[PDB]
Design a protein around this nucleic acid. Structure first.
Lengths: 252, 66, 124, 155
RNA sequence: GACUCGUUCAUACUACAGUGGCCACACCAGAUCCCAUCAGAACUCUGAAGUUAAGCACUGUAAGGCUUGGCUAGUACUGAGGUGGGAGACCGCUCGGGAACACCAGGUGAUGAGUCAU
RNA sequence: GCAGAUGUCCAAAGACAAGCUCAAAGAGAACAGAAAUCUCUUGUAGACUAAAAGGGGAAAAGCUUGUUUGAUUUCUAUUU
RNA sequence: UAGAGGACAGGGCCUUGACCUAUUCUCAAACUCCCAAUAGGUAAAAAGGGCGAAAUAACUCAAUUUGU
């Protein structure tokens, strides 16, 4: 038998395009964007955090019928001009990206002076709800790193504390935000086998940043982020099939 | 004995003899079980409006009657 | 190119078909072969098996080397000793059919099929 | 003998061919206000807030809005009189009715027509026309396509 | 050229091919750390040696499907009238409405907000 | 009138979340066979969802796991 | 209901079948990809609509000036 039958194709119903591509959940999405119908013109902002395998993206989205509107956006590659030239996929990079997104959103809204966020790292503020996007929500996830970044930037994003590194460990959260967990990896790799160390953190050395410079570079990056955020139609098809038949009559 | 179980015969002309009456469609509807925390606030709004209007009218009446 | 056929997975299977004691012994010998833990089958509990990867899989396949028909049409193969060896081998990029985010299918050009499976076995 | 809630809704409450699955996320974004007209179309994928069999395909005004539901006034015929019924449904089973969209477009268009007509003090007929008999037309046709028709024989 | 969030939810799907890559996605290198399992396969974390082989994008097929139009066809069916025909089954006429399967032909997308690269 | 079903059952078969995808077929692997377990491919549901039948359901409403008791008290507008 | 073509089982290269593919005759009140006619519902402005300013609120919103 064949399961790819003509009747099978006739009766097949396709998923949504985004579900087919695996981009969106479409259940989490509508639970995130659904607002009480009593509340007219209630925006219900969504803090979208995505992570490619090169850098992380944070944006502020509001759902509209014609399509989402993006009010702010920040990429980890923006950290080059803020002094983080390497490790743009890091927990610290995600925190910095969330901080940048929050600060730039508030600057666009002219609310920096009214919502200073926090200093260094340990009226009602803007409300946004975190969008994870297919990633599994394990404890110690860069999505929650970016959430903490935005929270420190001054946005009110509701969250628990079980998903920070350690089920609560504020010290571990601080060191992961500052990238200490990468510094310790650098130290242990260098101390155990230097060759693997230099083949792993190759661009770190090319950037001339060491295990002891990571924390300071992330601190000054945070402070400077804060202070300045072709087709072929039927005629050609017929001609081509005719010529293909003519060629085939002799070739095969 | 066996009886006629059911029929809708003559029911339509019975209905149309006095016409198919329509609902009265009053201007205002009771808000008894509707949207609390909204209609309570509306009560507060109306009280504030009435208080302002009444105090202004009382001021005018007192200043005109001396 | 990165089209070389690697060993994606090697599975050792022990199907006793009864309760413990012998099942526990089978789990223990699977432990000795691979320090990683085994899992048991159905409990309608009848069999134990383990999944290995990488250098351990390669060396266990070499140990089990001690027939050019038992290759599957999907480019996998296996044999027996008592224990069943079954190796599922695939090219690079098999992640795209297993990860959650943008899960899709590889093309049949990228699939391994039986001819390349046999050639890979002969070469190795 | 059998008069359950969903009796007789085998086809009415079934999803269309290749139209299965939950509602789109964009359905949750539609705006509803008090007193506007709305269509009650039951969506079988959502079981709570499901309207009764009778009200599928009816239209009514909003009299109540809740966080995920809506109350709509529907006229139902009961023998010798029409009577109002307050049906409460979830927002998946309700849809902004277009029963008056032509009326709203006519309102705005007639407003901006009357504005300029009064500006030029020209008296204009604004009511709809219910166009009937056409005028005489002095139509040309070359004799190359006046073809003669005869009733056909039987075969 | 590309990416994120969407809309439409097959013109968007499926199969088999061809072409394409600098930042771009991605495959990919690892498992100290958060985390995760029988299995670092997946998930999570840390990277940047390699590669367009794959995912992805574009195109192709007397491709299947889908879609639009035509045609089936004023056919089938049907509202109203008949002291119409016919033994009946059924079938005309008058005032009106009007399909479907199949077949044929074209097509295989469009688009909102934001962003990156040049 | 026709084909049936009800007077039950469930601390989970209720609640929430997460992860996963089912029936079946094909090919392959000591014992091992038409069926026992494992691997791959295809798989719009052809499984499952307490029961009759009909609707609904695929990153679920199904399977597994974790935590739970919203199967709680009170009162409205109402539908059949 | 019938044949037509094509790589698992049985016997003596052959047959029987199964199976697959494309067809073929004929059906459904408790079948449906499609789908009428008739029947049904809502709307077609003045106690209202549109457009603004000012007030009120304990509601809503990040907003004592967002919205309602």
């Amino acid at each position: 038998k064949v399961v790819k039958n003509k009747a099978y194709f006739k009766r097949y119903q396709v998923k949504y395009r985004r579900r087919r591509e695996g981009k969106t959940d479409y259940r989490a999405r509508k639970a995130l964007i659904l607002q009480d119908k009593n509340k007219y013109n209630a925006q219900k902002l969504r803090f979208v955090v995505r992570k490619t395998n090169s850098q992380v993206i944070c944006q502020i989205a509001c759902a509209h019928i014609e399509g989402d509107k993006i009010l702010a956006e920040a990429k980890s590659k923006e950290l080059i001009r803020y002094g983080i030239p390497v490790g743009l996929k890091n927990y610290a990079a995600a925190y910095a990206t969330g901080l940048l997104c929050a600060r730039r959103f508030l600057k666009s809204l002219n609310l920096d002076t009214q919502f200073l966020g926090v200093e260094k790292v340990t009226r009602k503020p803007i409300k946004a709800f975190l969008d994870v996007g297919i990633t599994r929500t394990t404890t110690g996830n860069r999505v929650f790193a970016a959430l903490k970044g935005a929270c420190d930037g001054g946005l009110n994003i509701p969250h628990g504390n079980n998903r920070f590194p350690g089920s609560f460990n504020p010290e571990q959260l601080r060191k992961n935000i500052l990238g200490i967990h990468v510094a310790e990896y650098m130290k242990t790799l260098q101390e155990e086998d230097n060759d693997k160390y230099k083949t792993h953190f190759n661009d770190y050395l090319k950037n001339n940043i060491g295990a002891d410079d990571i924390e300071q570079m992330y601190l000054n990056a945070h402070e400077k982020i804060r202070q300045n955020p072709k087709k072929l139609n039927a005629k050609l098809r017929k001609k081509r099939v005719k010529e293909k038949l003519a060629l085939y009559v002799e070739k095969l | 004995a066996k009886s006629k179980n059911h029929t809708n015969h003559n029911q339509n002309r019975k209905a149309h003899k006095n016409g198919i009456k329509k609902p009265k469609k009053h201007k205002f509807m009771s808000r008894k079980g509707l949207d609390p925390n909204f209609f309570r606030n509306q009560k507060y709004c109306l009280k504030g409006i009435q208080k302002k209007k009444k105090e202004l009218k009382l001021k005018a009446k007192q200043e005109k009657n001396n | 190119v990165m089209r070389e056929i690697k060993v994606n997975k090697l599975v050792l299977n022990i199907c006793v078909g009864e309760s413990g004691d012998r099942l526990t012994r089978a789990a223990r010998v699977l432990e000795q072969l691979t320090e990683q833990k085994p899992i048991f089958g159905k409990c309608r509990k009848i069999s134990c098996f383990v999944t290995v990867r990488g250098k351990k899989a390669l060396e266990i396949l070499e140990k089990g080397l001690k027939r050019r028909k038992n290759f599957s049409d999907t480019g996998n193969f296996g044999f027996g000793i008592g224990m069943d060896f079954y190796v599922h081998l695939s090219r690079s990029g098999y992640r795209v059919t297993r990860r959650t985010r943008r899960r899709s299918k590889i093309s049949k050009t990228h699939k391994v099929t039986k001819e390349d499976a046999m050639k890979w076995f002969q070469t190795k | 003998k059998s008069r359950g809630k969903r009796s007789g809704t085998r086809y009415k409450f079934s999803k269309k061919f290749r139209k299965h699955g939950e509602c789109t996320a964009n359905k949750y974004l539609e705006k509803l206000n008090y007193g506007d007209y709305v269509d009650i179309v039951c969506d079988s994928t959502q079981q709570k807030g499901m309207p009764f069999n009778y009200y599928h395909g009816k239209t009514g005004k909003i009299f109540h809005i809740t966080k995920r539901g809506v109350g709509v006034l529907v006229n139902k015929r009961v023998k010798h009189r029409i009577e109002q019924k307050k049906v409460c449904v979830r927002i998946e089973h309700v849809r902004k009715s277009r029963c008056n969209e032509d009326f709203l477009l006519r309102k705005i268009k007639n407003a901006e027509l009357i504005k300029e007509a009064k500006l030029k003090n020209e008296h204009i007929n604004i009511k709809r026309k219910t166009e009937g008999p056409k005028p005489a037309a002095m139509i040309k046709v070359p004799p190359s396509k006046i073809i003669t028709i005869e009733p056909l024989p039987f075969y």
